[PDB]
Paper text:
Adeno-associated viruses (AAVs) belong to the Dependoparvovirus genus within the Parvoviridae family. Because of the broad differences in their tissue tropism and transduction efficiency and the absence of pathology, AAVs are the promising vehicles for therapeutic gene delivery. [name] receptor ([name]), which is a glycosylated protein containing five polycystic kidney disease (PKD) repeat domains in its extracellular portion, was recently identified as a key proteinaceous receptor for multiple AAV serotypes to employ the post-attachment events of viral entry. To dissect the divergent rules of engagements between multiple AAV serotypes with [name], we select two AAV serotypes, AAV1 and [name], and solve the atomic structures of their complexes with [name] by cryo-EM.
The cryo-EM micrographs indicate the presence of [name] on the AAV1 and [name] capsids, but at distinct positions. The final resolutions of the cryo-EM reconstruction were estimated by the FSC 0.143 cutoff to be 3.07 Å for AAV1 alone, 3.30 Å for the AAV1-[name] complex, 3.18 Å for [name] alone, and 3.18 Å for the [name]-[name] complex. However, the structures of [name] capsomers with and without PKD1 attached display strict structural homology with an r.m.s.d of 0.27 Å for all Cɑ atoms from 519 residues, indicating that no obvious structural shift occurs upon [name] binding. In this region, the conformation of the βGH7-ɑGH8 loop in [name] is more extended than the βGH6-αGH6′ loop in AAV2 and the βGH4-αGH5 loop in AAV1. Particularly, this part on the [name] capsid has a remarkable larger loop region shadowing the SIA binding pocket. There are two SIA-binding sites found on the [name] capsid, but only site A play essential role for [name] transduction. Notably, the structures of site A on the [name] capsid and the corresponding regions on the AAV1 and AAV2 capsids display high similarities. [name] is distinct among the dependent parvoviruses, since it was originally isolated from a patient sample instead of from laboratory stocks of adenovirus and has unique sequence and biochemical features.
Author numbering:
A (entry chain A), B (entry chain A), C (entry chain A): 209 to 724
């Protein structure tokens, strides 16, 4: 109500209630006045050698809230209690509240910055709940609610890239400009707040279980099939058959088949024997899209890398994360030790690997002059009767994504991971309202001389999750995530001497097992 | 409600109501923004020569309220009316209120500190009422509500020490990190307040009476016992007996026995004849605990020191206090005159002393070649039928303590003194919410450049105490605490020329007597 | 009702319902007619060199049901879901049913055993629910419901050892004989069953959490104590003091102390450097009890062995199990690899170790001719203010035990582990009723010529357990039990090529952590 009255409390709890959990999470944000309160037309040409990077777009003076990562809601213990006890989870509800807003005036006079504040400047927030803006949230960008609650993060500047012309920087006649002050906002002073609720649509549970049984080994090895296989041909042209025996799985008949595949290059981590002095951009997996050719990591769902205890990964197919956040616009060459290299190892009984071929088809029609030839294929798409296992979600990883507004789509699982929503959580845009300076005379040109200012405040996000409870009759103990460290020099998922929150390793979700 | 309206009054009264007393106490506090609003990993090795001092832990940017001393609630007169009229007291209720919060911005520009204030910055308070944090309150640390009401105290920085590995500074896999912004707080501006109530659980009354009768002298010295004692043996092997006479207490049969004991070293105060040039750390009483060996002062309840008018104390077994508060991290070598050396002299009819042996057992089996031998023991633990007298509480001393969350414990009286609570009064954590500076561009690294600020305000604590009234038929006058000073140069428990509140001597609670 | 009608179904399910779980478990048993249907007076002298082993007792023709092990109710997966999610469990109810009884006549004629059956022979069962018999169940003996449900176990023969005279085999006048046919039984034919219910009394939860914080390190390492310690003495006799600093835990004042202790010998497992050619029976920990001296493994609660990653254990203080069951009356010398050696490693922040001393007391009274001496003690019993951590329960370990019917006891936690019940689950005695042979004439001597026969059947036991749910705000992932094997040659807690259920390692219950 007033300036000397808090407009919201710090809620950062987490209440497990049966097959239901709410995870409140309050963080503190800073909004710099981006672009000095005006729109800019940003563009670029063929940088990094490729004309893929040429874009046309607009950068706004708006910041936005991007809590589309799992660590923004889950502590590493509450994540551990999730991934070791439940076979699924999905979001149900969402409740965001921006509160305790305070706006500061920085005045640089005589080499002395003076950060005062006014009780009069406003901050306008709106929520794009009709999806009329480019939804830039679910695309794996920075600027999120941090993993650690007393970290104060800055809000990322809202920009978007529209259509360009002929892979150049120049616009096209179909490229549109969206003014964000053409949306009804809510101008908030230092005693006002912004509540907002959201109910998720029915999405499937994230299948957070490892396969406890191979896909091609679903028959029992005791009784043998009543189906015969072609084995050979005699000295004449006549065919011969044998019974499909019990333990032999390389030749039984199968009901179900693995998912999609596209063969990627396999690179050795760890000890490693790799090719030396490699500039691997011209040999990676491209996917041309009306013009230029784009790298597409990670490749679509239905594959895996890192079989089991193998140092070979498919680095084109994995979700490499960093241990700490980095400076925006860095060119440092990181190594295997610095980065959190994701392994989808557990999904190998269902998914084919990415650094090998899937199988082989026929090449020629046989005759008594022509022996039958085969040939390995590097990519196989959807076949009727396929079954795959989607990409695992991680603590340091995205929660949802938006399906594009095209007419058609197939099986909307995001390739990076998470949930494919049709109407995702709306993008909370926020900016500082501009305050003019010392205008003494009238001029028809708009004001360019504003009071420089930022604004800070807190925000809370209350998620709600529906759990799929574990119902297994497995006898022996399962593998579960544990805090195993051979006398470390530091506690992990906890600060250090400086105060830097330190995450050493990624945390998956497939730890419990389940028979096919 | 608003900034120009006080959100709480100064209550510092004390209302004696029958067998019930409420002691309100308002103080004024200052909260420095510790660690510049971020967590730190603190650690240390084997300092002071001993690997006992090696710890691993975290220091928070939170301050806390620690009113766990008796002088924070009791004036020296209201304490005197307590200790001279009542045989017991225990806490019943508790009511804490933080009010009149105001937060100041210090700006050091051109060698000129300018302490302004904003009406917009918040302060978040929560109360750990589920005991999910390390309860660092009841362990005899500084930073309390002062003994004197117009003293303005600063809030102590909340830190805790978790498990370390192999007596080094390095962490272990079982050492946990608690983020305190993961608790639901209450962000308070300059017009808001924080009320909180608490009801104590049923604890025993503090037995605030001296024994008016010895424990081994509970028979009357007029009639003699109907029980005989072994006295000697004749020139043959035959045993002989005598009757237990009336006045003789060194050989009657006893029903009850003293409490626990561990023999400590006895050091002479006053005039004194002590060992010279002593480095007494290698000769003190250690108690090894999974690794290193810790000094444990004071040793557990059931002993005493300073018999009666003896300059010999057990300095390992007493509660030495200071006359005035000291600078944090001092290495001054204080003397007997500066310090308030506690004497548990009055509990000598029940408790054995600490600088002597308790008794003697048998050493050998006797025969007609072997005379019976004895041997003095230096420590005797709980025996069925024991009775002891717990440590006295003092005006300058702790009120409660928390029992640890292990499965088992025996007789939870804190060795330092006071009340052993299972669910103690919850620890009121409080910090300044961080205000960012002049962030002009987006970066994914968290904000490290905050506006430096502190916040002050008042706090009141209303205790409630249940009294055990004195019901004695003693004829002669009892000893009571009195203001006896042979024409002092200053009034005691009152300020001086500078304005320093001066306490010269400790004040016990056992002044009235009571027969066993 | 009839012989061609099953009198009970196979229930071996396990239903997790909130903070409550029922574990049904059906096994199949065989009852040999022990002693050929008559009582025997069994006795022994000082075998194995020690007169401790001399006993006097009686062996009955009764078998009994002994489901007092945790694997008899918990599959290794249902045990894993318990020990990784809950901070406690205790039994609430019990329901035993003996059903599908069938009794077989073996007839050895002309070197040809012919196992027929009659529909007429009975089997009598009763339940000792007034505790009038010696309760031989809770003492860690064989003959239990197996860990694996399709294992068919035989019922152990009920015997007991009464008082003997002067450590010989001869009886005493106070040694009593209990006839078990003097109890009202229930004679069951092949169409009858025996239902029985039992409600447990309120026992404490098993504290199934590791300490996440040391006992002597409960102060925070940031603020320092308001209590001073004796440090040394100057060149004169005068004492000197220092403040207890913050990080230093070897010299702060403590509120709580570890539990009981008796120093045992420490033997190195693993790589190991041990004494060679050892006959360690004359150097172990004995406890003399009215006559002879008994080994007492494991020593009472409040200690530990195996600090952390140390090959040294206290083999006198641990619960060594076997991988497979063994033949009754074996003398094989097993090794470290064959046996399941229990480690109580996680209870080291609270419990002192068993292969070291606990601390040191004072030895002499100091003076200026006598320096202060100390001395390490090997055993310390209950001290007021103690806190310990009881022995962990295991999957291959006992559930309950009976407190003896003496007048007094202290803290009835069984030293082997589990629950100390005053009225334990009653001992289900069962025997074959005797069937006489071909008696053709009258004689006053009783019949010694019976039809040799055994009887088999199924039994189910339905336990009910109350769970103490995990409520922690820990951030980082906890250590949990997992199925970790570096490509084993066999699945563990599962059969092998022969069909032998193979357990390789013991499973504890303290996996989650909890602050003190």
């Amino acid at each position: 109500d007033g300036v000397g009255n808090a407009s919201g409390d710090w809620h950062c709890d987490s209440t497990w209630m049966g097959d239901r959990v709410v995870t409140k999470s309050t963080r503190t944000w800073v909004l710099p006045s981006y672009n000095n309160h005006q729109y800019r037309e940003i563009k670029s040409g063929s940088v990094d050698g490729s004309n893929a990077n040429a874009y046309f777009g607009y950068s706004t003076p708006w910041g936005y809230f991007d809590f589309n990562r799992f660590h923004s809601h889950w502590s590493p213990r509450d994540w551990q209690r999730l991934i070791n006890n439940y076979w699924g989870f999905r979001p149900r509800s969402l409740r965001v509240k921006i509160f305790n807003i305070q706006v500061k005036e920085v005045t640089v006079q005589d080499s002395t910055t003076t950060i005062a504040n006014n009780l009069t400047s406003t901050v306008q927030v709106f929520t794009d709940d009709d999806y009329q803006l480019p939804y830039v949230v679910g695309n794996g960008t920075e600027g999120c609610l941090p993993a650690f609650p007393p970290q104060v993060f800055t809000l990322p500047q809202y920009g978007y890239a529209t259509l360009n012309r002929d892979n150049t920087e120049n616009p096209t006649e179909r490229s549109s400009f969206f003014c964000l002050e053409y949306f009804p906002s809510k101008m908030l002073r230092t005693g006002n707040n912004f509540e907002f609720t959201y109910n998720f649509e029915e999405v499937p549970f994230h299948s957070s279980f490892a396969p406890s049984q191979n896909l091609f080994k679903l028959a029992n090895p005791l009784v043998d099939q009543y189906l015969y296989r072609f084995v050979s041909t005699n000295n004449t042209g006549g065919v011969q058959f044998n019974k499909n025996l019990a333990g032999r799985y390389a030749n039984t008949y199968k009901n179900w088949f693995p998912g999609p595949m596209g063969r990627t290059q396999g690179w050795n981590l760890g000890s490693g024997v790799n090719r030396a002095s490699v500039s691997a951009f011209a040999t990676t997996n491209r996917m041309e899209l009306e013009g230029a050719s784009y790298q597409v990591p990670p490749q679509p769902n239905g594959m895996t890398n890192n079989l089991q205890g193998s140092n070979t990964y498919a680095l084109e197919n994995t979700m490499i994360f960093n241990s700490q956040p980095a400076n925006p616009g860095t060119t440092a060459t990181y190594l295997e030790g610095n980065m959190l290299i994701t392994s989808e190892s557990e999904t190998q009984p269902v998914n084919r690997v990415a650094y090998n071929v899937g199988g082989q088809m026929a090449t020629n029609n046989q005759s008594s002059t022509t022996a039958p030839a085969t040939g390995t294929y590097n990519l196989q798409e959807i076949v009727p009767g396929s079954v795959w296992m989607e990409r695992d979600v991680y603590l340091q990883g995205p929660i949802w994504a938006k399906i594009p507004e095209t007419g058609a789509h197939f099986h909307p699982s995001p390739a990076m991971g998470g949930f494919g929503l049709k109407h995702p959580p709306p993008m909370m845009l926020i900016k500082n309202t501009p305050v003019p300076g010392n205008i003494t005379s009238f001029s028809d040109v708009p004001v360019s001389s504003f009071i420089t200012q930022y604004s800070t405040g807190q925000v809370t996000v209350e998620m709600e999750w529906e759990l799929k409870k574990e119902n297994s009759k497995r006898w022996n103990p399962e593998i579960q995530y544990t805090n195993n460290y051979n006398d470390p020099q530091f506690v992990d998922f906890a600060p250090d001497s400086t105060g830097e929150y330190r995450t050493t390793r990624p945390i998956g979700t497939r730890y419990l097992t389940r028979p096919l």
